[PDB]
Amino acid sequence: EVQLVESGGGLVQPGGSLRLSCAASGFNLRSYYMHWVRQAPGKGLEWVASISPYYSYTYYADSVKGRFTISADTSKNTAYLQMNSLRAEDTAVYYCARHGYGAMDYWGQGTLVTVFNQIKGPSVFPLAPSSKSTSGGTAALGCLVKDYFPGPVTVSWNSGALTSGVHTFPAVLQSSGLYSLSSVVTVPSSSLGTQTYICNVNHKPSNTKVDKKVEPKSC
Amino acid sequence: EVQLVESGGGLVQPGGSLRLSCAASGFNLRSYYMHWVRQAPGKGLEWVASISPYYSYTYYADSVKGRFTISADTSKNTAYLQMNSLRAEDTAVYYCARHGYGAMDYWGQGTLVTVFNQIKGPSVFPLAPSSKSTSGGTAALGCLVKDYFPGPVTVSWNSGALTSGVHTFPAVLQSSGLYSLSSVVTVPSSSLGTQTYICNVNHKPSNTKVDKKVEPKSC
Amino acid sequence: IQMTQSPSSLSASVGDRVTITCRASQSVSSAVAWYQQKPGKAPKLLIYSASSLYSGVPSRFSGSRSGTDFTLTISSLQPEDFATYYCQQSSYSLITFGQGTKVEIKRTVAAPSVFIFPPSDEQLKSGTASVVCLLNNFYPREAKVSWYVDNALQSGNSQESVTEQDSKDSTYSLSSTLTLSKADYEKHKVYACEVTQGTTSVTKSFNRGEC
Amino acid sequence: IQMTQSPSSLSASVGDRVTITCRASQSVSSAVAWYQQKPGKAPKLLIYSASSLYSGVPSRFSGSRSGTDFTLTISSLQPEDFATYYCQQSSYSLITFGQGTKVEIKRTVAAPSVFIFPPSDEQLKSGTASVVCLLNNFYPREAKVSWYVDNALQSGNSQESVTEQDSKDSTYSLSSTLTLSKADYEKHKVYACEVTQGTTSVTKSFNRGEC
């Protein structure tokens, strides 16, 4: 009988890319208005997009306009929903339905689209150099990158001028599901008195850049 | 310059559907052989698929033939990789590269495709009726569905003949990331002696069907 | 338009006459449709053109339009009619939905029949013991299930699941699953399940070994 | 064909002459290419037609073909050349890759300079204390980092990350991060980090309050 089957769901990070599929049987999908409707877990109904038979006039909701694309392929009798620039609100069960009279006659089973653990800007703490750490004429300082999601973070030192001795460590996954790493550089012990040292951390996911000047430990 | 950008990665359950994208700049993608190469986390290189300029002759690896589709869109200067019937081995970082001379000249940054916690057939245990439970002439029995992934499981009683009194509970997510539920039915206390009671659990994800005959508790 | 559905929820016993109002902010498009979304299923078309009964829809459902306040009427509420109902406008490719009206079925307050199941001999061998307590055919939905092991109250090691409202007698059903290790289950004797509704509390129990 | 790359891994000091052999099971297609995949990056084309040097590839790399055993040669190993290298066949749309040959750079065995960092005043206010121990510019890769708090050995509350081999001096670098609550950090005085390489063990320490 008239049956709408949906596939392509899953979990994606904010942004990402997901193409939901909706294959039809028992009728020519090119002969009907087709709609996409989403339902947030434990919430109401929100119309997402639509397409016209043959004319292929695509209509969109204002909440997705500029991020989502609805297209149909007559050969496979299947309608599609391409999802880019995904956000937290885009987490919902997505249905595909066929327009009947002035309503939606038939409906699919729906497939879920879920967002990730959401973006999180990093926290930057100074790995303070100390006289106790100071070994001969070689002192060590750094600045820690903690609790960021997702990857990556670009760490540079003194606007990129400082390269010799810089060691940025690979990111770890803490038990809180949050990425973390650190970057350190070895400096002359004499340079501690005069040379200022700023770490340059950039988080393009969160569009956040942090610049911390590591300084001698005190009380 | 010549730049290949990839998107569309994420995590999907076995089966599922994922369309990786590969947008190009600085050259006409319709004028080059384009390849998809995957690298399993901490493993080697495996060629996935290929496509021909203009002629659009698609070539595939035997490990994906019948599940993956490679297509190119000249208008967007972008090549695509559609991924269905996904499995555990399909977990890898996927790159798109352009054929140069007799090799791959330029490469993208690569996007990751990850499989879920893998399929897991359910365990079925009998909720044993007892005289202590036996209330007047109404006894209760069921059979528990434990540690299955993903959803759903279809539970019926006595090949579907038993419907009155059957109560199948919504699935829970145990701390082990494994779905679980139970289905119970109330029976006449006299019927315990003669009527056999079999629960019919079906797990289409794992293509497994379990039929357990709940019986009086003993020692 | 802004489909304002009233109320957000309501409860009514079997046989009651139920009215749901959906008001369009500013529209004249008579094209308004009604749907029924049963828990966990897809929206089911009920009424289109705010007057016409979709083929296969029970008599009880009826539609009307108070100019801007399109109303859905259930003449004789049945226990199967428990669901969430939505209204839908179609202006110039402008498909807007109401916030939704959940319908629960009221019923004479009844206590649950309670059964307790010791973990099976098979599950014990695996290494995990699951003790399940059943609350059958009770109303209303709310209750308090507490687990006790040798008169020591348990916490955090239980998971409960409640059925949807029974489509015949309008009651619920709940199962509380208590999960313990094999070693823990072998280290105790008295297992009891306590359920608290209003002024009444009931406790089923079993003793490890008693046959 | 079945590109059999030999060996699966090798280590060589700076200036050594390095050879990697890739044998085709049964082929005559001279179209064989070589790539260098640095850790965390995309494969970089090195040699094509098993003889021609891709534009922008250092002299040191060279290719050859022993009929079935296509070989890549690095004349003068540089510390930057540390990477995993792959060979690639292109038969009739048959792009097959070798298992891979990892190249590590051997170097005179050196001990790490060790520094310890008490958690910053800022991170303490947040509620979490992270004490980080640094192992700088040492060889070989392996070591044993142990955390001690008031001479009590810690376990499970540490995370370590090791850099890739330094592209100049061929050494590694490792950071062990020990994570503790604010209350736990305020309840102890002596914090020490112990590193064990072969016959030598070194311990840096700090005492809460000493300034």
Tab-separated table of N, CA and C in Angstrom, chain D residues 36 44-47 51-63 72-78 80-81 85:
chain	number	residue	atom	x	y	z
D	36	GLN	N	53.783	9.604	1.944
D	36	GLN	CA	54.220	9.789	3.322
D	36	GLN	C	53.062	10.358	4.123
D	44	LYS	N	50.836	12.315	1.834
D	44	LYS	CA	51.519	13.263	0.965
D	44	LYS	C	52.211	12.489	-0.147
D	45	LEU	N	51.865	12.809	-1.392
D	45	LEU	CA	52.470	12.140	-2.536
D	45	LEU	C	53.965	12.411	-2.579
D	46	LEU	N	54.750	11.352	-2.761
D	46	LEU	CA	56.198	11.483	-2.820
D	46	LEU	C	56.758	11.136	-4.195
D	47	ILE	N	56.533	9.912	-4.653
D	47	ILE	CA	57.104	9.406	-5.894
D	47	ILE	C	55.960	8.814	-6.705
D	51	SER	N	59.418	6.085	-10.254
D	51	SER	CA	60.724	6.662	-10.561
D	51	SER	C	60.764	8.188	-10.459
D	52	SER	N	59.619	8.843	-10.628
D	52	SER	CA	59.564	10.295	-10.778
D	52	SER	C	59.263	10.969	-9.446
D	53	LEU	N	59.972	12.062	-9.177
D	53	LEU	CA	59.872	12.768	-7.905
D	53	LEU	C	58.809	13.852	-8.051
D	54	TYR	N	57.709	13.712	-7.309
D	54	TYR	CA	56.656	14.721	-7.324
D	54	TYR	C	57.235	16.089	-6.992
D	55	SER	N	56.716	17.115	-7.657
D	55	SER	CA	57.236	18.463	-7.480
D	55	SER	C	57.116	18.884	-6.022
D	56	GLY	N	58.242	19.258	-5.424
D	56	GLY	CA	58.277	19.632	-4.028
D	56	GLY	C	58.694	18.540	-3.066
D	57	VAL	N	59.277	17.455	-3.554
D	57	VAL	CA	59.714	16.335	-2.720
D	57	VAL	C	61.231	16.402	-2.573
D	58	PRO	N	61.778	16.279	-1.343
D	58	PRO	CA	63.234	16.399	-1.147
D	58	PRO	C	64.039	15.412	-1.991
D	59	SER	N	65.325	15.701	-2.237
D	59	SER	CA	66.144	14.819	-3.076
D	59	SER	C	66.184	13.409	-2.521
D	60	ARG	N	66.472	13.304	-1.224
D	60	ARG	CA	66.723	12.086	-0.464
D	60	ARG	C	65.835	10.924	-0.876
D	61	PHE	N	64.570	11.191	-1.157
D	61	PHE	CA	63.656	10.142	-1.582
D	61	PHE	C	63.916	9.744	-3.032
D	62	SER	N	63.958	8.436	-3.285
D	62	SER	CA	64.138	7.909	-4.631
D	62	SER	C	63.384	6.592	-4.778
D	63	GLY	N	62.974	6.296	-6.011
D	63	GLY	CA	62.219	5.087	-6.288
D	63	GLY	C	62.871	4.136	-7.274
D	72	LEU	N	61.458	2.048	-2.324
D	72	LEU	CA	61.657	3.461	-2.032
D	72	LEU	C	62.930	3.618	-1.214
D	73	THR	N	63.760	4.588	-1.585
D	73	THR	CA	65.049	4.799	-0.942
D	73	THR	C	65.131	6.221	-0.409
D	74	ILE	N	65.536	6.355	0.849
D	74	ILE	CA	65.882	7.642	1.438
D	74	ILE	C	67.394	7.657	1.599
D	75	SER	N	68.064	8.514	0.830
D	75	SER	CA	69.523	8.501	0.804
D	75	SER	C	70.107	8.983	2.127
D	76	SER	N	69.617	10.112	2.634
D	76	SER	CA	70.124	10.713	3.867
D	76	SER	C	68.933	11.022	4.765
D	77	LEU	N	68.678	10.146	5.735
D	77	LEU	CA	67.528	10.322	6.610
D	77	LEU	C	67.641	11.617	7.399
D	78	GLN	N	66.575	12.390	7.376
D	78	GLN	CA	66.427	13.589	8.167
D	78	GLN	C	65.438	13.337	9.296
D	80	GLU	N	62.916	14.963	10.001
D	80	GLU	CA	61.567	15.278	9.532
D	80	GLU	C	60.934	14.116	8.813
D	81	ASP	N	61.751	13.161	8.388
D	81	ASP	CA	61.296	12.041	7.592
D	81	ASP	C	60.590	10.985	8.424
D	85	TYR	N	54.928	5.275	5.846
D	85	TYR	CA	55.021	5.329	4.394
D	85	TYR	C	54.237	4.178	3.775
